[PDB]
Amino acid sequence: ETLVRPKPLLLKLLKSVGAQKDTYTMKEVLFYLGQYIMTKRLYDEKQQHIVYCSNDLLGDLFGVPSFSVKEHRKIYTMIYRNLVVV
Amino acid sequence: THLNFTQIKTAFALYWALLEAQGKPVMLDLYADWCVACKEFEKYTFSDPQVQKALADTVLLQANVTANDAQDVALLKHLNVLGLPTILFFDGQGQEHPQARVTGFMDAETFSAHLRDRQ
Structure with a gap:
């Protein structure tokens, strides 16, 4: 929805x-x-x-061995922990 | 002329899609060619601009299982779908309300009634 700049690692994955x-x-x-x-x-x-x-x-990027897509909030935080905002 | 549905193949894609919604309520139309009731649904009910507006706040998903291939059957088995047509509804946290499954054809009106039994 709103604009954000991925950190080096989340960018390296994203370009892939x-x-x-x-x-x-x-x-x-x-x-x-x-x-x-x-x-x-x-x-x-x-x-x-x-x-x-x-x-x-x-x-390494989420810092967990595994996760369930069912746990919306947790993943949202793991992502946001790799952004910043305009 | 037609509603805008994002296509899904794997159960993963569905689960990821429910995450991407986060908050918005979701509708999942199973679709196939060999399912006439599905094409009947598509053409008559999802064109109707009353329906279309009741869904404007709602994220719209579609699986095409016409191929009935392995990823198609796994999806259907995991979802516990018995046959088409079948339309599934999710609240904003991404849990299906099974009460509100539609397992048959409906017109614009009847649909909008069932959208008083959604989420």
Whole structure:
């Protein structure tokens, strides 16, 4: 929704799924993030709402071994912990 | 002329989509060609500009399972869908209200009544 500048790490990931910008809306960041997980297939095929980042940049960036997409707020904070605002 | 729905394939895409909503209520239309009731739904009910406005505050999702491939069946099994048409509703935290499943055809009016049983 509102404009934000991803930190070095969240940018390095974001450029990897075809974002060329340096400044994004929120909905964008969420979108390109979803894509990174689909791309690297970090979700469990059985329980698709479960994401394994331990052993991947996303783990270091969120600082957890795994998480459930079901926990909206937690992920939102883990993201925001890698932005700043215009 | 047609409502604007973002397409989904995997259960992941759905769960990610519910996150991206955060706050907005969500509607999920399962769709297929071989489901006439679905194309009937699309053309007659989602064109109707009364419907369209009752959904303007609501995020709109669509799965196309016409292929009935593995990712299509996993989605359907996980969602516990028995057959099309099926339309699913989510409150703002992304939990489905199963009471408010639609499992049949409805016109513009009946739909807008069922949108008095949403979220």
